[PDB]
Design a protein around this ligand. Structure first.
Ligand SMILES: *[C@@H]1O[C@H](CO)[C@@H](O)[C@H](O)[C@H]1NC(C)=O
Lengths: 51, 51
């Protein structure tokens, strides 16, 4: 029961990814577990976002 | 979309080629700056009258 979820964190976002991980720790359950793939990019860049 | 994206060299040359253009056309004098915006244009200021 693996759930793949993508994620996009703007370069320079630290506390956000921290709270993301903390959330991953707190809301984890025996039923299913989220399997995040984190990608840092230039959030203002449309090409980067599309890619 | 192939990552990392690689641009061709020729592109810059074609860009400079386009930006260096100065021609006469329906929009009046056509010339561009380094960034590609219009320069030295003429916008006719018009008013609607009875006739
Ligand atoms: C062409 O544009 C440049 C940029 O402002 C300006 O300095 C120059 O006077 C313009 N030429 C004419 C004929 O308007």
């Amino acid at each position: 029961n693996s759930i793949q979820i993508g994620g996009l964190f703007p370069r320079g976002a630290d506390q956000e990814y921290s709270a993301f991980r903390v959330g991953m720790v707190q809301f984890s359950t025996s039923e299913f577990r989220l399997t995040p793939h984190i990608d840092n990019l230039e959030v203002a860049n449309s090409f980067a976002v599309t890619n | 979309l192939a990552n990392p994206a690689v641009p061709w060299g020729q592109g810059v040359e074609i860009e400079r080629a386009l930006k260096q253009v100065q021609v006469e056309g329906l929009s009046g004098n056509i010339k561009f700056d380094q960034n590609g915006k219009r320069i030295n244009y003429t916008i006719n200021i018009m008013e609607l009258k009875t006739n």
